[PDB]
């Protein structure tokens, strides 16, 4: 739609004022781009905490996935946006969500080595024994990355 | 010296002839162009990495080259782009005065030593080191009308049969093909390759083996066996020539016996090198040639030669192929020359009319008709010697000089005619006295006018180069005019003019000329009686002077300033920008709608629309395009409503309706390298390896801050492209080693298929051309197609790409900028209405200082030159003043009297500002030089009035008021004759509506309006200025 | 003698030799310079706080200073009193032998896994009719 | 190396020659391609032309052609020098 | 160790180096400082 | 004047059947009949 | 060779005009120059 | 221009003798140069 495109750009940029207006005007919160990213995906990726909260309040799909099956929790967990990861999980984000590769937010958070997020994901009941298409756990990544602190948390 | 040539009229005639011959010779040989070289020397390093993304190109090519641009002479700054098309451009801009050849070879040499550090594929494609030049002489479009040929089919014919001949044409400096010559395209089928257990690696291996030049040797080569009879060259395998031969390339032989060939696993055709651009001319497929003008060549002759060459190529053209001329500057340059020669002739015709109106004899009217052409020709000889070319700036530079050239002729003759009338002296002795009265002033005037115009040339940067063209042109013209006035015209006046009886002012004649003499003689008495009353109450005119000075200063500040006025060139641009991530097809639909509008609703105005899909000045990609609109003849489009600006603004309003596209039209600037006055060019640098995202945020922080000052800064925007979605595909190393698949085979299969791979050369009809292996369209479109590509493992089994790969979406730059070997982000913008650039820049510097730690800034392009060369303006103005004062001080032998002359400046300027502000023109170069010629002539008039008045007080021991009234009486007629002639002479330029009118309007209006005040005011005011000054200091 | 032309004539001849030189000598980059043998000035760089080592200071000077000074007009040559950082792989022969490996395998592996690949584009030109997706493909990149 | 005149002319001579358009003070350009594989494109310039500047202008224009040439030709090398056709002297050497 | 290019002006080149170093100082890490332990231009400037 | 040329034609399909690489063929012909520049050596303190 | 011959007429033409104008200026006359310059053919025939 | 009255001599291997023989030739020259303090002073090689 007309406003759908302006929300995607506004959600990406981080313009809180423009989002508020578009939420009032009635912009589609499930409006995807070409790759299949909702405004929540954009806000989750670029780390805009308020817009993530604003979109979720406006009945935005928290478990919306792209053409490759990656959710906003994947993008938030991978790029180390601790604050956003918590908000998504509270609004009912699937912590064991698998993309087309079988990669969960735990795998991504482990690979970039975001210690604080790994604990939060585990706290909300993340499957630590979860494997990707190559049969790799979050622990398998930590020992291959050589992250001693991360490996100890996964024990 | 006048006395020397009054007794020696033949010596003067010899000098006249020598000058005329030298000038005549110069006009024949002088180069002809639209505009000369103005922008500083720049060297553009360009390369291509087929299939490579922005980052890949940057971190493999751009950074490596940038690091090895060390020990080069007179380098100012170095900018670079690295885009997702696989292209890189590094523009090294040099100091104004640097040898562009030395600058190029120094860059080209330091690159050669960095070539071994670049990737194999980039070394293979090559790196081009060229001198920057956007100024095309003309673009020759080549189109197919019967739809038998594609754009690639046309491009090949142009490359083979036309380009080489157009290159060898007399006066052509460089030629640029719009499109590529044929390439052997192998469109691979992944389902077929997997069926026979093959890969792109095998296809590349097979092509390199079976399409190659093999060395053999000779029969009976030295050292031979003594008694050898025959010595012949052994010819082995050579390069393939046809698609059929590439089809019969053997890949594999099966056990059963049946053979696997390249045609069995791929489609083969003679295609283009790349498919990024889709060129169209009113819907029909199109290519073309970008022709540039050689150094010191003639644009008119070069154009005629190109057309004459294209003409004799037409008989060999295939059925459907036609030549079109969407862009051509020589039509404009033809009119520029004709209109100037028409003005210079009409000027001398009007002098004849004015000379005869007042003096009333044909022996007087000839002397200016002789003297002026002698100077005009002489000027060409001096400019030819200085190495100048016939261009718009030097042409109009002489039109502006007409005022000074016409005066020097009139002043000398009138003064002789006056002395003969008042004293009844014979022509020869009357000329000796006449020249005796003015010779001192004319030598003074030369040094004064020199002091005005010479400093104008000493300006730096692009703007300073334009001023230099007007400066040397006017100084040269004026210099010879004074020289001719002291050599030729005295001799002519002494010989040609007949005697006049003492007291005979032609009041005793009949008819029109009888009435005019009594009319003027009593008008002269009204004028002297008038000045008489003015010189009793001088106080109120010093008040009226301050009203003019405040009037001037007011209008000066509240007149919009520019570099050059926009012209109707017969063409204009129309940008088409779609949302980022859009496809080539989407952009074509918009360009089709844009092309439709112009050929439908603007059918009366528009001739053709060159729809270039894929091209964008501020970044390439599928989601950008340009429509090059070509209009019909200037005569066929009557009224302002059917001119470019009117069509431009109508089109912009129409295309604002278009759904998902930023579409708008804009007229082309006179010179592209300047940009816009009020506009600035700001570079935001990464000074501590912060990365891309951290510089993106810092840019967004500055753009947000700049937006919160609309009163100072407007249209503040990034020049670059925004981050776009990209398909990240991690190759699992363990899974690849486990199945026995090498990383070379994986990265080659992906790179060759999806990106393309330049394998080697082949010879199509005796021309070396490229061979590209790539995936057929339908197997390299969507992420699902990744899994359909199979790589062979060491064990022999075929492994799909899915088995050892994982993919996800991320955001990355499709065009990474750098400035002085550091990551940069160019930000454009302009000063708000009323504000100067200096104010706008000073705020941008303040906002920049409150950005995160590690983020620096710098000024580039027009802003870099404005920061440095702009500061010279007052220091030259100062030097000019001191020299002018010194020159007048020497002339009059008085520190005080010079002031009387220097007070005349505003009288000429006020009129120019009225005419400009009234009409709605700008403070442009044509107007600004237009002032200096109006100031120069008003000063010249005053210098004579003050000299005459002074000489009467010194020699004949007259009173101040007596001498002043006597002086202004004698100088009344020649001032009116010069003005009447010049104002009528420049009148056509003011009312001009047709081609190149914008410049004529700027030149004409700023002179006519200024001359009206300069004449009307100075005749009353210079008397006042002299009296007040002479009283104050004596 | 025109030093600018002297450089051009000398390099013209060096370009004929460059191919005949080893692959290793070319990849270190041959330089043709026209400078006075004696030093104009020495620009010393130190850390007063003692936060950075001799090797750290040298790296910064090479990475964030040297290039711009070398590009400056009149600067014939710039000698770095130090060395720019480089990813050092300090090999252990006892450990290479244990896993049946050599320096060759280490060099081969680095060349394969530390590589910046040209992987093309999705919906790249020439595309199919009715394509809506266009995005650059990113395979392996350089290691940081 | 190991190329015939026909092949050399198509792949090298014509490629270089068609990049030698628009050079300051060029009178004429003679060239030859032989069966040994050699090319020799001699550009004669106007009388009084700065020979060193001429050389630079040619070198610059050649390096646009350089990458379009075959791989073998680039590895062998290409020179751009000021050339006279006749010998000042021949200095013979014999063994008595 | 900066060496003067063939036929270039020592003082003018030295001035340009200081202008380039002056643009780098603001973006230095905490503690880093420029020192001038050798320079031939100060003599040429003062001696004249 | 135009000279005669000895045009030898290598059958790559027939070579593959016998199990010989066309690289070895090209090198064997090229080296033998034309001569091949392998590398350099030192003849009395000079590279040749 | 052809260049030398093609410019020879232009060379004689201007050379005559210059010598004529040079004499015209020096002796302040048109008769003296024209009276002298009629001698040129008497010399040229001797050379031929 | 160099030091007041210093000289820069080059000893050349004109007939491709080798390094060792050029070293011995140099040692012979330095030996004979050493035993003329009245004429020559501090004569030494610049190399290692
Ligand atoms: C490749 C090149 C292309 C071709 C270009 C061609 C260039 C041609 C240049 C040569 C032009 C020469 C023209 C000569 C004109 C002579 C006219 C009079 C001749 C004559 O003998 O009469 C004299 C009196 O004439 C008088 O009345 C003398 C008074 C002053 C006369 C001035 C007016 C003449 C105008 C000449 C210029 C016109 C041509 C412009 C190009 C007597 O002689 P005398 O010795 O008794 O004189 C006394 C002085 N003491
Ligand atoms: C410093 C500077 O910009 O000098 C310029 C500008 C200039 C100083 C002018 C000389 C003189 O009128 C000046 C006076 C005091 C003249 C009287 C008033 O009208 C003043 C409002 C005016 C201010 C500027 C002006 C107009 C200059 C000259 C001298 C040129 C003189 C002649 C005869 C053409 C110059 O440019 O050389
Ligand atoms: C820098 C000097 C300052 C300006 C001095 C005065 C400028 C005005 C005079 C310019 C006239 C001389 O310029 C001369 O114009 C004539 C026009 O017939 C041109 O003559 C040309 O006409 C047409 C134009 O397309 C061609 O097809 C043809 O081949 C040729 O005869 C010359 O190629 C040009 O050199
Ligand atoms: C339309 C605006 C553009 C025009 C710009 C030119 C302005 C000058 C206009 C012409 C002025 C001449 O007009 C002249 O004015 C002066 C006043 O100063 C008059 O002078 C008269 O009044 C003054 C003041 O009371 C007396 O000292 C004087 O004795 C008396 O003759 C003249 O009688 C008249 O002839
Ligand atoms: C340096 C400025 C030149 C000003 C011109 C001076 C000319 C004065 C002539 C005086 N005169 C000799 C005619 O009596
Ligand atoms: C095409 C004309 C070029 C002119 C070169 C310089 C002329 C000098 C004349 C003395």
Author numbering:
A (entry chain D): 12 to 166
B (entry chain B): 1 to 1034
C (entry chain A): 98 to 241
D (entry chain C): 50 to 145
E (entry chain A): 290 to 337
F (entry chain C): 722 to 769
G (entry chain C): 866 to 913
H (entry chain A): 674 to 721
Pull text from the paper.
CH4 transport-compromised AcrB-Phe380Ala shows binding of FUA at the lower end of the TM7/TM8 groove proximal to the cytoplasmic side, surrounded by TM5 and TM7-TM10. This implies that FUA may enter via CH1, but also via CH419 and is in line with the observed substitution phenotypes. Since β-lactams and FUA have been shown to be transported via CH4 as well, we realized that the c-loop may play an important role in drug transport not only via CH1 but also via CH4. We therefore compromised the entrances to both CH1 and CH4 (Phe380Ala_Phe563Ala), and observed indeed a strong sensitivity towards FUA, β-lactams, and the failure to grow on DDM by cells harbouring this variant, whereas wild-type activity is retained towards doxorubicin and rhodamine 6 G (R6G), presumably transported by the unaffected CH318. In sum, the results suggest that CH1, with its TM7/TM8 entrance groove, is the main transport pathway for LMW/LPSA drugs, DDM, as well as FUA and novobiocin, starting with binding at the TM7/TM8 groove and peristaltic movement of the drugs to the DBP. β-Lactams, DDM and FUA are transported independently via both CH1 and CH419,25.
